[PDB]
Structures are given as structure tokens and as C-alpha cells.
Scaffold this active site. Structure first.
Site, PDB file in Angstrom:
ATOM      1  CD  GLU A  85      -2.611   1.300   2.588  1.00 20.59           C
ATOM      2  OE1 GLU A  85      -2.198   0.659   3.590  1.00 20.59           O
ATOM      3  OE2 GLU A  85      -3.609   2.049   2.624  1.00 20.59           O
ATOM      4  CG  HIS A 111       0.404   4.771   3.693  1.00 19.03           C
ATOM      5  ND1 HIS A 111       1.051   5.485   4.681  1.00 19.03           N
ATOM      6  CD2 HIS A 111       0.855   3.496   3.794  1.00 19.03           C
ATOM      7  CE1 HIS A 111       1.853   4.678   5.356  1.00 19.03           C
ATOM      8  NE2 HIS A 111       1.752   3.464   4.838  1.00 19.03           N
ATOM      9  CG  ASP A 130      -4.722   5.344   1.867  1.00 16.54           C
ATOM     10  OD1 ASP A 130      -4.643   6.571   2.069  1.00 16.54           O
ATOM     11  OD2 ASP A 130      -5.478   4.589   2.514  1.00 16.54           O
ATOM     12  CG  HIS A 164      -6.971   1.286   1.448  1.00 15.67           C
ATOM     13  ND1 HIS A 164      -6.046   1.115   2.456  1.00 15.67           N
ATOM     14  CD2 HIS A 164      -7.568   0.084   1.271  1.00 15.67           C
ATOM     15  CE1 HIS A 164      -6.079  -0.139   2.869  1.00 15.67           C
ATOM     16  NE2 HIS A 164      -6.997  -0.783   2.169  1.00 15.67           N
ATOM     17  CD  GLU A 169      -7.712   2.336   5.324  1.00 14.48           C
ATOM     18  OE1 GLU A 169      -6.868   3.075   4.775  1.00 14.48           O
ATOM     19  OE2 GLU A 169      -7.450   1.179   5.715  1.00 14.48           O
TER      20      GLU A 169
HETATM   21 MN   LIG Z   1      -4.975   2.789   3.880  1.00 10.80          MN
END
Ligand SMILES: [Mn+2]
Ligand SMILES: [Mn+2]
Lengths: 151, 290, 290, 151
Positions: C155, C157, C187, C224, C260
Site C-alpha cells: 500500500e 500512503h 491509498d 483505499h 477507509e
Molecule cells: Mn490505507
């Protein structure tokens, strides 16, 4: 279960077989958004009515089985679920008296995917500098009653 | 099977005290363990609350129930049922329909191990007297109850006096039939002497003295240890608990005293009825010795 | 088996948003129905949270899981796992131990129907780069992942930039191996432009523009849909959602955008994250058309 | 479940088969310390954003089966458990729009073991003179969101 880390259910003195009170137990829920393997756990210090009790007096029962701190440090395969509070058993001859008791207990767990600054300086008896509630507080308190005959 | 063999009165808890938690923050097993923390062995359940898939639990659920009883040293004492012959808006149930419902509850109570039923009926007047055919209903079920070792007991509670008409109607029935399987549950609200300033009390209510229970004790098979307020010295501040318990000890009572808390604060956010019950059981353990 | 056949980006929810409720006031089935009220079909679970008896669920539990998916029209999309080679305090796991753990999670993810894994690794520096043997770990599991049709995705982010070293390390690995079973989860915090007055922001962070995602879209298998604040007009007030979603629509994205929410107020008494998520999904349904 | 009577989970529009929105549903938990048979239930009146909807527009699904008010009035054998919220299905063509909605719903149930004064004058749309929380309020409210495309 309960929102607090220290549960009200499961707090009681422990007896012997021979009838002698050897200590007491209480339960703690993992205040984390995911479970952890036993080797991630870092148990800390207990205070019962101000009396300090060190982690080497306290065993952890998870999944029906009792573990010492050393056993837990080496077990990265047994999983502690967030919905299954651990039972902490505290060695203390005679146990706790009738009535109220103030519990303060600290523990934490490793999260190696977090930034190194956050990881370093992780202490079961002291809080993080920046509180993230999805990890819970390391130290938690509760005032609970013991049912016992008068002293 | 766990059995609790203490001689004389024994303590326990009625799960009605957990009515604000059950199904929300407490499971059935949480209640069992809460009783275990107190060292309390006797339990009262409500048939319509605590039995999954009531009225027809599975074999699997019944075995889980017995496992819980053994795991936490719980003795099933009292089973709360309703013979609600007013369940329909348009008519009363016949005597036979009421008897059929009662017998099913006696069967289920026996299967879960209970020996006392706290049976509630529709009431027809301000004296809280039961429906007029109640004797017929009870006489329809008494053979089964005698066969299975169950005692059916209506509950005496405020404002009904231990010397009033309601109690004497039940005692008269017991004497006339000779049955050993119908009796009384005395709720301790009948002894309450202290009330808050400006708290409304029924003009029909007069506290009974503890000794008032003595002539009824042959017929009392279980009691609700009702309590209003526990001080931080673990004393109950509205009912003469020392004297009630000593009276029943000294006059041969062998049944249970099951804590029952009904304060409106059970439903307040943050209330912890488990702690209230622990206060009450500090009291009860010191009065009883175990 | 319910299948959701909408062309283009699809919406869903990551159960991490329920982290303050799960196991307390929401069951797994409550979350499934909460997604159903929203008309959301895609789901993300956390392996270590949402699977009973993890890591070894029963056949009975697995069948209950599939029944829930069909009952509420839920598509298992993303499965969150940790390859925690730092699980022991005294040593790192070997490459082989890490691969064994990863393969078990790939097996379980496949059994529950998931097609994307959000895999998290221990990080070794402030750039949040994974452990140094990560390529070996991933290459140990890629054959199984390819056989079972699973895509493993770290992920991206905040503060990691879509043009920074971390992203380019993953993209380079994908290009060098040619794998179609390792990719990226983006994300949406990487697009956040608005922050509160006096709110600390990492000096290393710089918002990406929506178009910055375009060259990575061949490798993005799930996202996300992070969000900070939903207004009562059902607009997100910190991230350019219209432009992000339009960019991914116009450039061929076929995966999911899974809501999320991570605000600290999830843990405040009285907070209702289900309502927050409903606001977000009003937004997402209007932007996507379904 | 939730502490409130009207649950937040299960509130949504209902579709057709032919795709047309015919109404909407929401769930209510029995706020009683014991379950009741269906014939004890007294459904009352719904208000959605001030719009009044009478009980003959609302069916009750308990134990997976849908019942009309009349069917419930005659069924003294099907049991409604306190842990199994009923699903109320409200006839209303087109359903509720995107966004917030204020629900006010009333219902109650018979308790024939209570004193006759309390029983008499039991009304699903009006509260008892003396509130006993173990019976819950007859009338309950909730502000909830609907996910839908813009009007
Ligand atoms: Mn996340
Ligand atoms: Mn009572």
C-alpha cells in the site's frame, strides 16, 4: 465484552486445591484493530492499590493455555484474537481482601510496519508521544470489587 | 454435575439483574462467569429470555448449557415462566391451553436441571390476584411437576402483605390439596422499611417484620433477595437483612436467596450492575458464611 | 455466488473502518448488512481480525462466510495480511519462514474468494521501505499467487509520493520480473490537499495531482478510498474526489475503491461510523453511477 | 446490536424484481427484559420526516417470516426474542430519497402480569405515566442516512 481494557468479568482470587489463596486473576482485551502472535506481546507492570507487582509474577492464559513471559517471547505461531481477552494470573499469597481494589496495568505489542521512530522507545509502562486510539493505551486502570469474607 | 452442598440458606443471582446488559455487553457465559467471580452458585433464568430458540432449544444448545453449569459451578435453581392466558387480545386461553403451555415449561425446566419455577400469571385486580381458573391450571400440571421433582411458586412482592389475602389463598390451596409441589417465592421487598424522602409508597403497603415469614417457611421454596441500595460498607440500607437471614437460618430454611436488582439506574449509561451485585454478595457471604 | 459486473471502478468498504465496533457492537454479519444498506458490494477484511480461529478456520466457518457473501451480495475483494518477519524480538524470520507464512495467507485468501492482498511488511527506514529480502519473499510466493489468481499489493500512503523511491522500487520489480501478480494499492491520502489550521503535516509530504496516478494504473489492483471529512452535502472536503475518480474512470481502471476511515473519533463514545460511511457512499455512488 | 430501539443496520429502500422501489425497511429491537409472542405486540404509527404512515402499511418480519398486523394478533405461539430485532417493511412507492431522514416509531406489547391500572390505557403511540426502563419507551426516534442517487 467491555470497552475498557481491563474487564470486570473474571476478576477474582485463585485457590489451591489445598484451599489456600495463591493469587488472583483479571482479564485484558487486546485493544488493537487486529490480533497478534504471542511473541509480539510486551507485558509490563501491575499496581494493585499502589503495591507494585513485576511481570515475572504474572502469567498469560490465551486459547486455554497458560504461558510465561519467556514462553510467549518465543512463540510466534499462537495467535491472540481481539475478541478473546487474555487471563492474567498474578502470584500473590493470600490474594486480595474483600471490597474495592484499584488496578493499573501496562502492556503493549510490536507493530513492525509502523515508522521506525514510533517503534523505537516502545515501553509497556509509558504511553506513546502521539496517541493513536486504534492501538489503545499501554496503561489502563479499573476499580473493581472482590467478594470475600471479612478480614 | 456440580452440586453445592452447604446446609442452610444459600446465595445466588437472578439473571434479571443483568437485563440491561444481556444480549448487548454480556453473553450468557459472561453472566455465568460473573456469578463465578462472586462465588455464587445458584441461578435464576427467565424462560423467555435466556434459552436460545425458545421454546424449542436444540440438543446442542442444551449440552452447551450443561457444560456452562459444570464449568462455572452453577446450580440451576429457579426457572421463571409465564402462564399468560391473556396472550391473545381477543380471548382468554382455555384451561387446557394454559396447562399445555405450563407443562411444556415444566419439561424444559426439568431438562435444564431446575427444581423451582417462579410462575407468573395474568392478574385480575389491584390485589394482584391470579386469573380465576388458576387452581384448575395448577392442578392440571401438578402430577407432572410431582413426577419431575419441580416446585411451582408464585412470587409474593410489594404491596402484598405476608398476612394478606393473596398469600392466604395460595397457602389454603396448598393445605387443601396436600401438594408438595406448589409453594411460595418471597421477594424481600415485603420487608423494606426505609424509603427516600418524597418517594411515593403504596398506601396499601405495610412492611412485614422478619418473623412474619416464620409460619410460611414450610411453603417457601426459593426467595428473591431483592435489594435497593448497597453502602460502601457493603450493608443494605433499606431492608433488615441481618434479621431476615438470621430468621430463615434459625427456622430451617434450606433454599436459595437469589439477588434481584431492579433499579432504574440499570439502564443508565455507564452503570455497572456487576459491581452492585458484588456489593450485595459481600453482604450475603458474610451473613451466610459461604 | 454473487458476482458484481459493473464496468469501470466499483465501490466498497474496508472493515478496518469498523475497528472500534467489531467484536463490541457489530458482528461480522452486522458489517455485511451495513455494506448492504449502502449498496456496496466490495469488501476488505484483515486476516488477523475477521477470520475466526485464524489462522485455521473450520470448514463450518468457511461455509458460513460464503453464505454471508451470497446473502448480502458481497464480493471478497481485498485480503489484508502481514508478512511480519519481525514477529520475534530476538531475530528476524528467515526468507523461508516468511514465504511459508505468506503462502498460508495466500491459500486462505483464495479459499475465502479474495483476489487482491494488501500485504504489509516490516519497514526499515523513514521512507517506509520494506525489509531488504522482500523481493526474495515475494518471489518465493509468486508462483502460488499466479496459480491461484491472487495479486499481492503493498500500500502506498502518505507521506510516500507517487513519484518517490518506494513506488519506483515496486514498479521496477514488477518490470524486471514481468509478474502480473504483484502490484500496488494506492491509498487516497496521497492526494489530500486540505488540512486543518495548525495541523502538523510531514515536511516530506507533497500532494500528488490526480493525473500522477495515470502511469501507475497498469499496476494498481485495488485502492483505499481514504477520506477525512464528509460534509452534509455529501462532499469530501480534503481530497479532490471528483477529479481522482474521473481520472481513473477515463484511464481504464476496473478495480475497487474501498472506503477507509481512520479518524480518532471512531473511538469516541457515541460516534456512528456507519453513518460516516453512508455519507462517503452517497458521494461514491453519485460519482460512479452505481 | 445497538442500545437504541431503532437500529442503524438494516435501514434501506426495498426494490421490486421489476426494479421499482416499493418502500423501505428498518429494524427494531424488543426493548423488554423478555421475549413476547406475536399476539402480544401492538404496532403503532410511523413518522418519516413528519409524514405519517399508519400501521396497515407496515409488515413485521420475525424469525425470517413476514407477518401482517392481523396475522400477528392471532399468533400466540411464534416467539420474538430480545436478541433478534424485527424487520419492519413500510409500503411507500419510490421510497426515501438520498440523505438524512428522521424516524419516529411507536409500538408496545402486553404484560398481563402487571397491575390492571398499568395495563389499561396501554397505547403504542403514547408513553406510560410512570416510566419503567425495563419495558422501554413505546415511541423511539432515530436520524439515519439513505444511500441513493441524486433526485
Ligand atoms: Mn490505507
Ligand atoms: Mn422479585
Amino acid at each position: 465484552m467491555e470497552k475498557q481494557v481491563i474487564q470486570s468479568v473474571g476478576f477474582r482470587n485463585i485457590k489451591n486445591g489445598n484451599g489456600e489463596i495463591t493469587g488472583f486473576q483479571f482479564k485484558v482485551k487486546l485493544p488493537y484493530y487486529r490480533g497478534v502472535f504471542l511473541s509480539q506481546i510486551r507485558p509490563g507492570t501491575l499496581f494493585v492499590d499502589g503495591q507494585k507487582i513485576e511481570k515475572d509474577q504474572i502469567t498469560w492464559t490465551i486459547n486455554g493455555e497458560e504461558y510465561t513471559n519467556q514462553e510467549m517471547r518465543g512463540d510466534f505461531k499462537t495467535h491472540w484474537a481481539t475478541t478473546k481477552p487474555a487471563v492474567l494470573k498474578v502470584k500473590m499469597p493470600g490474594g486480595l481482601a474483600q471490597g474495592y481494589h484499584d488496578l493499573k496495568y501496562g502492556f503493549c505489542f510490536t507493530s513492525s510496519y509502523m515508522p521506525p521512530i514510533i517503534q523505537d522507545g516502545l515501553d509497556p509502562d509509558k504511553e506513546s508521544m502521539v496517541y493513536m486510539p486504534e492501538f489503545g493505551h499501554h496503561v489502563n486502570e479499573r476499580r473493581l470489587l472482590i467478594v470475600k469474607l471479612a478480614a | 454435575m456440580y452440586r453445592y452442598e452447604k446446609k442452610g440458606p444459600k446465595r445466588g443471582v437472578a439473571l434479571y439483574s443483568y437485563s440491561a446488559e444481556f444480549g448487548l455487553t454480556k453473553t450468557l457465559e459472561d453472566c455465568f462467569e460473573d456469578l463465578h467471580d462472586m462465588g455464587a452458585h445458584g441461578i435464576e433464568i427467565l424462560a423467555n429470555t435466556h434459552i436460545e430458540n425458545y421454546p424449542y432449544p436444540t440438543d446442542e444448545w442444551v449440552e452447551k448449557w450443561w457444560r456452562l453449569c459444570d464449568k462455572y459451578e452453577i446450580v440451576p435453581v429457579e426457572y421463571g415462566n409465564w402462564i399468560d392466558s391473556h396472550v391473545l387480545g381477543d380471548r382468554d386461553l382455555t384451561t387446557e391451553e394454559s396447562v399445555e403451555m405450563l407443562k411444556r415449561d415444566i419439561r424444559l425446566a426439568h431438562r435444564l436441571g431446575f427444581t423451582v419455577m417462579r410462575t407468573k400469571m395474568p392478574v385480575i385486580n389491584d390485589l394482584l390476584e391470579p386469573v380465576e381458573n388458576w387452581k384448575e391450571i395448577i392442578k392440571g400440571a401438578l402430577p407432572l411437576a410431582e413426577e419431575l421433582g419441580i416446585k411451582m411458586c408464585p412470587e409474593i412482592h410489594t404491596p402484598s402483605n405476608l398476612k394478606g389475602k393473596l398469600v392466604n389463598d395460595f397457602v389454603e390451596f396448598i393445605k387443601e390439596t396436600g401438594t408438595k409441589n406448589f409453594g411460595l417465592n418471597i421477594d424481600f421487598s415485603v420487608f423494606r422499611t426505609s424509603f427516600a424522602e418524597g418517594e411515593w409508597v403504596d398506601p396499601n403497603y405495610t412492611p412485614n417484620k422478619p418473623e412474619d415469614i416464620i409460619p410460611l417457611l414450610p411453603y417457601v421454596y426459593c426467595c428473591h433477595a431483592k435489594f435497593i441500595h448497597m453502602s460502601d460498607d457493603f450493608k443494605e440500607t433499606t431492608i433488615p437483612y441481618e434479621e431476615v437471614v438470621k430468621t430463615m437460618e434459625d427456622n430451617g430454611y434450606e433454599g436459595y436467596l437469589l439477588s434481584e436488582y431492579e433499579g432504574a439506574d440499570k439502564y443508565d449509561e455507564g452503570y455497572e450492575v456487576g459491581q452492585t451485585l458484588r456489593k450485595h454478595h459481600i453482604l450475603l457471604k458474610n451473613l451466610l458464611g459461604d
